[PDB]
Design a protein around this ligand. Structure first.
Ligand code: HEM
Ligand code: HEM
Ligand SMILES: CCCCCCCCO[C@@H]1O[C@H](CO)[C@@H](O)[C@H](O)[C@H]1O
Ligand SMILES: CCCCCCCCO[C@@H]1O[C@H](CO)[C@@H](O)[C@H](O)[C@H]1O
Ligand SMILES: CCCCCCCCO[C@@H]1O[C@H](CO)[C@@H](O)[C@H](O)[C@H]1O
Ligand SMILES: CC(=O)N[C@@H]1[C@@H](O)[C@H](O)[C@@H](CO)O[C@H]1O
Ligand SMILES: CC(=O)N[C@@H]1[C@@H](O)[C@H](O)[C@@H](CO)O[C@H]1O
Ligand SMILES: CC(=O)N[C@@H]1[C@@H](O)[C@H](O)[C@@H](CO)O[C@H]1O
Ligand SMILES: CC(=O)N[C@@H]1[C@@H](O)[C@H](O)[C@@H](CO)O[C@H]1O
Ligand SMILES: CC(=O)N[C@@H]1[C@@H](O)[C@H](O)[C@@H](CO)O[C@H]1O
Ligand SMILES: CC(=O)N[C@@H]1[C@@H](O)[C@H](O)[C@@H](CO)O[C@H]1O
Ligand SMILES: CC(=O)N[C@@H]1[C@@H](O)[C@H](O)[C@@H](CO)O[C@H]1O
Ligand SMILES: CC(=O)N[C@@H]1[C@@H](O)[C@H](O)[C@@H](CO)O[C@H]1O
Ligand SMILES: CC(=O)N[C@@H]1[C@@H](O)[C@H](O)[C@@H](CO)O[C@H]1O
Ligand SMILES: CC(=O)N[C@@H]1[C@@H](O)[C@H](O)[C@@H](CO)O[C@H]1O
Ligand SMILES: CC(C)Cc1ccc([C@H](C)C(=O)O)cc1
Ligand SMILES: CC(C)Cc1ccc([C@H](C)C(=O)O)cc1
Lengths: 551, 551
């Protein structure tokens, strides 16, 4: 029996097979020593005992507004944001570590960008049980697990007021770096780029980009419909878009991410960002009449990347966190720190971001209430209502609570089922192992995981042992913070991936973070003062209610 | 007239075109302010005035052996090595900056690995003269310039005692990251990897690697000849090798770098490293009987990458430098510093590494003296003499002095001619601009460049102005240090690229630099104690005289 199946090495120690049946843990730089890296060094011990729980820190951050208001207007704001940035980031390996093919560092894992990386090695194929040495010989049926604990019965809105404007932003944004390859299989991605490169606007490959570009004034091709600007058609921009068989090219919109024609919300954002790109080109040309099409295009792209990182940290994440602390996007906060400006999307981060519970039972646009069947492959809704109308509608409709269980609409429950199946193919280690990998104590029972007893009893009967609970299921079934959109694990595990992805970008490095990179002071300020409201309203005829929070 | 043609921005300030005819310099973080970034800050001025010249520091490093010996045995050795590593490295942009297509930062320049990067932007195409605003309307004829100042008349040996064992190591080693693509043109490379990835041994692409691997015990395919181990034939390892038409596959060796069959010296190293890879596999399997072929292969590769870095720093660079300071390869020296573990080969670095003057008039192997025509595409010499014999021969024959001028054998003078032509296509800025970009004062005349009067007068008559002198020519014609192999520019410009290349490797990062990465303490020590002598002798029947220095 493979000793590493027991996950003997603690605190990021590395389990290596030695001889026919022995194992050793490489505790290098873990802060611990001993056979299993559990004997702490004096400094390590002080840090671990003097640190408040994720639950207590969360409390401090969502209480005492009056105090935080004072803090948010001083340098303490910076000090804390930097603290948040470094502490969350150090939890992500960089250079990247393993991939679906190698549960060990290798030159292939480091140079081969078609692979998603992974934080914890896989469950060795030769282990007694699917999860290691705990649980039953066979995992609970994915389908059953989903219907029992993930299916929505009664719509549960997000207590934090998150809306569909946010939901679709999330779907739009994440899909620029989550593009699992159907051809290569699980564990592989076509979103080389691995981060905020805006590939969902410009395309994940040159040829597509060239087909999407006007090659005049650095602009992106487009078309006018009802006196409004929209992405061009595939006929004008011959690029592969995944539309239902039968829909003509002249009726398809070409945008960068092949999958965006399958939801008005997605194309909505495609339209907004496309309008913002061409707008920025105008501002740039005014500043540099001697610039060619290429430089105008390249420079505008860097600007939008900046705007995206800005808005994601200061509004998107802010919304999700519900923190009284005013999050801040300022690369300089890291100029005095040891930080690698690179990123590699992890398969776990992909699993974790499946926030389908956000989707509602139906989609309300003014007096009209559209169903999934009327909404999903709708090729006219966006143009019928226009950008302003849809933004207003999505900004008003509440999105569903992510954590807590039983809140995924039956229309898309199938995604969760496949997420669970893919997880087993990827052989993700147990939820508890990830709890530990991210600084939390493992759950000692299902009743501790869920703040209740009914689901816990059934889960325990199915899994047999809390140490067998799988990654994704653990994330969605964990008990949620007070009036939060999800549990602590979602944050403690997601923040590192997210923040490392945002700041790990090259435009955030000392070499790139300069006015000249963005065409000058005008371009640099577009990044620095970017805003959701401005992203929309500076590109629409009228300004509707725009926010990631319900009115 | 494009104002940036004057190279107005100093100290790494960035020239940006504004309005119809204005320009601005982005002095962000340069240590200077002002229209041209020429007004120094207090600390900046202190550093530039309190810093000794490259010539004085070089003096200190090559005198007082007794003092140095004392220092080398103390922590001062680590202190100076860290200084050297950090000061030389900070001179290289990271993330990478421009490429042949973009004289400005862009997402395309950052993500597109098929491009060599460049430290200084190109000479704007719309400038008055080919070099900017100085020199004649037409540059000196490349052919003529080479015959007049680069052609060898009388063989000039390297006063530092460098041998052919070193010369071939350099060619072998560098050809893993300098692989200009004929199909795409100058400015493009096939050596994705941009560094010490050992692609010249394992191939620059997966398919090729696969054809080269045995897929057993993690070993590399091979063949036996005279009881000795050699690389396999193209027949057993069907991989593309550039051999002259007319030679049969059965006499073509397959090695990783398509060009290595064109010199016994190159294949010699191919053989040595191949034997070392398979040897390491043995040691590894002894340690991990449960490991599969893949892990054995991946782990051995990481080990050889380490051995390569170790030897290049402590023996290779040591020999070139001539320093009494004992250089050291220890990744930990940088763990407390702000350093990016990434690298991108620069086109200027490619130009600079054209050390053809190293090649002799003929190749002596014992009593036999072989001509270029008997040496260049010889497919039997390596096997006829065996590894030991050739190593001994190359270790005894002195290589030619690199700097000084008039020392490139007529057989390969054509390379230099093409290097100069490619330079103009790449539109490399003038030598003086690079002097400045690397911390030196520009030469005020050709007489200052060359420590003499004749060549200088002829060069001045051809170029018209010292500010028109080109990159490569400047490097080879600059006056050499006392009894050195080349001038200061070669070191002051090359050291930064070289060390950044070496330490910027991901195996030198905190995440990778651990015993487990190399299979354990045994593998880790192979890296830490790697040696040229051991690389050869631990893989040959007998141990010949092996060194980068003539006996
Ligand atoms: C009702 C609206 C939505 C529909 C119809 C939908 C549909 C899908 C489908 C069909 C897949 C691929 C499923 C498979 O291969 O089995 C998928 C993947 C995914 N969805 Fe959704 N989704 C919706 C909303 C969202 C939202 C709001 C988010 C939150 C950001 C989200 C995040 C993801 C992620 C992260 C993936 C995996 C991406 C990848 O690996 O390529 N989805 N979704
Ligand atoms: C007599 C032995 C040698 C021969 C016959 C030779 C031949 C060549 C040839 C034919 C090219 C390509 C020329 C072109 O495209 O116009 C080349 C490139 C080059 N050689 Fe050599 N060379 C020799 C020795 C060396 C040595 C000792 C070094 C020092 C490390 C060296 C470094 C280079 C470099 C850096 C390049 C450019 C690589 C690239 O861009 O792909 N060569 N050599
Ligand atoms: C000043 C020293 C304080 C030591 C208190 C550290 C407490 C943790 O102690 C460690 O717990 C591990 C299990 O969790 C054991 O495996 C280790 O052997 C034990 O040393
Ligand atoms: C007063 C509030 C200060 C907030 C700054 C601390 C930054 C949060 O830091 C995070 O805290 C988690 C525990 O909640 C840990 O599990 C994470 O690893 C750590 O990065
Ligand atoms: C006593 C000698 C100590 C030498 C260690 C200093 C490290 C060398 O450092 C280098 O010096 C050059 C000038 O010589 C500069 O042009 C380079 O930019 C700098 O990195
Ligand atoms: C490496 C190994 O086999 N060690 C075992 C451990 O796995 C087991 O859990 C324990 C009993 O509690 O006894 C010991
Ligand atoms: C002192 C200590 O921690 N040793 C443990 C041992 O008790 C345990 O059986 C084994 C497997 O988990 O790992 C190691
Ligand atoms: C999943 C995948 O793409 N793997 C491929 C494999 O199918 C192919 O046989 C091999 C040779 O090129 O390269 C790799
Ligand atoms: C993989 C990739 O995108 N590489 C591109 C290549 O396709 C293109 O031909 C070249 C010229 O722009 O630049 C680089
Ligand atoms: C096929 C489909 O459902 N598309 C709908 C259409 O029926 C509806 O009338 C319109 C708004 O009026 O929005 C879109
Ligand atoms: C930007 C510009 O045109 N400024 C010019 C400069 O180029 C020129 O060298 C100088 C005369 O010495 O006068 C001024
Ligand atoms: C005070 C100063 O340095 N200004 C210089 C100016 O004199 C020069 O003409 C121009 C072009 O080099 O660059 C700027
Ligand atoms: C030098 C090079 O490879 N550039 C290519 C170009 O020739 C081609 O037309 C384009 C479309 O794919 O992509 C890029
Ligand atoms: C460009 C590259 O090398 N990517 C490789 C791909 O070719 C291979 O099929 C796959 C499976 O190993 O891994 C990755
Ligand atoms: C074609 C050629 O020149 N190859 C030479 C051969 O002539 C020489 O006799 C041999 C050593 O004896 O080394 C090889
Ligand atoms: C879940 C994740 C994708 C979003 C997220 C939420 C909160 C935070 C804050 C700054 C933190 O570090 O606690 C970061 C990122
Ligand atoms: C020219 C270059 C390719 C080799 C080289 C020579 C000397 C040094 C020393 C440590 C230095 O920094 O002066 C580094 C690299």
């Amino acid at each position: 029996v493979n000793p590493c199946c027991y996950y003997p090495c603690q605190h990021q120690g590395i389990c290596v097979r030695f001889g026919l049946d022995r194992y050793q843990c490489d505790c290098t730089r873990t802060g611990y020593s001993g056979p299993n890296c559990t004997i702490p060094e004096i400094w390590t011990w002080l840090r671990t005992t003097l640190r408040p729980s994720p639950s207590f820190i969360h409390f401090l951050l969502t209480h005492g507004r009056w105090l935080w208001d004072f803090v948010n207007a001083t340098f303490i704001r910076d000090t804390l944001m930097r603290l948040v940035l470094t502490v969350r980031s150090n939890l992500i390996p960089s250079p990247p570590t393993y991939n679906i093919a190698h549960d060990y560092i290798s030159w292939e894992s480091f140079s081969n960008v078609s692979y998603y990386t992974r934080i914890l090695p896989s469950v060795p194929r030769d282990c007694p049980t699917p999860m290691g040495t705990k649980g039953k010989k066979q995992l609970p049926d994915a389908e059953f697990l989903s219907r029992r604990f993930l299916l929505r019965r009664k719509f549960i809105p997000d207590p934090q007021g998150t809306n569909l404007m946010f939901a679709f932003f999330a779907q739009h944004f994440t899909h620029q770096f989550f593009k699992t390859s159907g051809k290569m299989g699980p564990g592989f991605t076509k979103a080389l780029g691995h981060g905020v490169d805006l590939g969902h606007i410009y395309g994940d490959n040159l040829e597509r980009q060239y087909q999407l570009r006007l090659f005049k004034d650095g602009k992106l091709k487009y078309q006018m419909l009802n006196g409004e600007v929209y992405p061009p058609s595939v006929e004008e921009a011959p690029v592969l878009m995944h539309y239902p068989r039968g829909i003509p090219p002249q009726s398809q919109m070409a945008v960068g991410q092949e999958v965006f024609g399958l939801l008005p919300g997605l194309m909505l954002y495609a339209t907004i960002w496309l309008r913002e790109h061409n707008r920025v080109c105008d501002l740039l040309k005014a500043e540099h009449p001697t610039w060619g099409d290429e430089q105008l295009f390249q420079t505008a792209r860097l600007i939008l990347i900046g705007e995206t990182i800005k808005i994601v940290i200061e509004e998107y994440v802010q919304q999700l966190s519900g923190y009284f602390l005013q999050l801040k996007f300022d690369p300089e906060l890291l100029f005095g720190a040891q930080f690698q400006y690179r990123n590699r999307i992890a398969m776990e981060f992909n699993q974790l971001y499946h926030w389908h519970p956000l989707m509602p039972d139906s989609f309300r646009v003014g007096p009209q209430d559209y169903s999934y069947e009327q909404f999903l492959f709708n090729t006219s809704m966006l143009v019928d209502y226009g950008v302003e109308a849809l933004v207003d509608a999505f900004s008003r409709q509440p999105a569903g609570r992510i954590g807590g269980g039983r809140n995924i609409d039956h229309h898309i429950l199938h995604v969760a089922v496949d997420v669970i199946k893919e997880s087993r193919v990827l052989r993700l280690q147990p939820f508890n192992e990830y709890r530990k990998r991210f600084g939390m104590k493992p759950y000692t029972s299902f009743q501790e995981l869920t703040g209740e007893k009914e689901m816990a009893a059934e889960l325990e009967e199915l899994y047999g042992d809390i140490d067998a609970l799988e990654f994704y299921p653990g994330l969605l079934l964990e008990k949620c913070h007070p009036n939060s959109i999800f549990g602590e694990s979602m944050i403690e595990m997601g923040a590192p991936f997210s923040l490392k992805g945002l700041l790990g970008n090259p435009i955030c490095s000392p070499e790139y973070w300069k006015a000249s990179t963005f065409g000058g002071e005008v371009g640099f300020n577009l990044v620095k003062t970017a805003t959701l409201k401005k992203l929309v309203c500076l590109n629409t005829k009228t300004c509707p209610y725009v926010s990631f929070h319900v009115p």
